[PDB]
């Protein structure tokens, strides 16, 4: 019996609720006071992160000054001024002419200068108080990217001292980067997630599971690699150009034939049969 004396342990049912969902949405419902409605409200004006900035930021490893200048320009466009100041400071503080020296006795490393590590620590503390994951990830990426017998002890200490990022806190920086990457993925932007994750010190683990091997075009043996271990020749040859394939490739699991990505794309743009004459409709047998 519903609502009988046997249900003393069951709490009274809810009739109202509010919940954060997505990245910038609040979903709530209340008692009508015949069922009510559901309200979805955008609250992007409350979080310390911005979607537009996420869309506009770039991270080029090869050039740092260009990235800093463009990020400053975009931050100015959005309307954040402290971001402009911080990005300009990062532009100055990460120039190439301040490269550390191998010999500790030649000059004081720029990391020791108060406008280096201490300034970076102060900025990180301020933004940690503000809980701005985006800026933390960007800074911890940009500054890290620059890294790219008593004598031995002294040299090791010098190596440990010439970095603007304290090696004792690599874990915190990696956590910042991972959290920002997850936020980016939730936003729907995927390329930015990969770009950010390319700066993680800790590498991930390889896939443990199903793998693909290729029959050698010469000895027909099972070879795990682009070059045979017996015949020492190329094992995979394109089914269209009949050239050795070393990079990206595609193949039909049902027919076992494949080759160069662009070549097979061009072939299957108009045709629908396996280009080797096997008779397999590789599109219908592959696109699961």
């Amino acid at each position: 019996a519903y609502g009988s004396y046997q249900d003393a342990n069951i709490p009274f049912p809810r009739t109202s609720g509010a919940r954060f969902c997505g990245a910038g949405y609040l979903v709530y419902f209340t008692r009508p006071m015949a069922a009510g409605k559901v309200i979805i409200q955008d609250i992007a004006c409350l979080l310390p992160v911005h979607k537009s900035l996420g869309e506009l930021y770039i991270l080029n490893v090869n050039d740092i000054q260009e990235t800093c200048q463009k990020n400053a320009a975009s931050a100015l466009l959005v309307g954040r001024k402290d971001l402009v100041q911080v990005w300009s400071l990062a532009t100055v503080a990460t120039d190439l002419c301040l490269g550390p020296k191998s010999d500790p006795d030649l000059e004081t490393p720029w990391a020791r200068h108060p406008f280096g590590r201490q300034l970076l620590e102060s900025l990180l503390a301020h933004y940690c108080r503000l809980r701005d994951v985006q800026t933390l990830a960007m800074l911890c990426s940009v500054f890290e990217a620059q890294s790219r017998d008593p004598r031995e002890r002294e040299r090791d200490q010098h190596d440990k001292n010439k970095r603007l990022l304290d090696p004792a806190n690599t874990q915190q920086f990696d956590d910042f980067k991972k959290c920002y990457g997850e936020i980016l993925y939730r936003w729907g932007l995927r390329e930015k997630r990969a770009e950010v994750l390319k700066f993680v010190s800790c590498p991930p683990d390889p896939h443990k599971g199903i793998e693909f091997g290729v029959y050698c075009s010469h000895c027909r043996s099972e070879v795990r690699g682009t070059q045979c271990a017996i015949c020492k020749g190329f094992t995979f040859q394109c089914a269209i150009c009949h050239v050795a394939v070393r990079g990206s490739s595609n193949f039909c699991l049902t027919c076992g034939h494949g080759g160069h990505t662009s070549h097979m794309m061009e072939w299957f743009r108009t045709q629908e049969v396996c280009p080797t004459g096997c008779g397999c409709h590789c599109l219908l047998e592959s696109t699961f």
């Binding site: 995927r190 029959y215 682009t226 269209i240 490739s249 696109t287």
Partner: protein, 106 residues
Amino acid sequence: AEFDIHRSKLDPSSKPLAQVFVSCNFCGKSISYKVTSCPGCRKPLPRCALCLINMGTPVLAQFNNWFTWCHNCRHGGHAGHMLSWFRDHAECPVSACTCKCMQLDT
């Protein structure tokens, strides 16, 4: 290719041979397929490097749902995603990978 198709249609004895086989790196058993998980170890297919979706899961432009694989970097993913990524970048999108899989062939 058209000539080969005609020859195969007329001559069945001239059928080509398979080029790629499936072998698990944990169970070590050759797998013939399609198949959802490893028949022996139940391990799943590799996931797309950009969408983190397992291979074989669904979702003209139907070609975009293929799996591009790079035997050099042993990484791969959805055709459309990987092509879009390589259109502007020149490295394997996986972290700590440096193979230029698309630019390698030329």
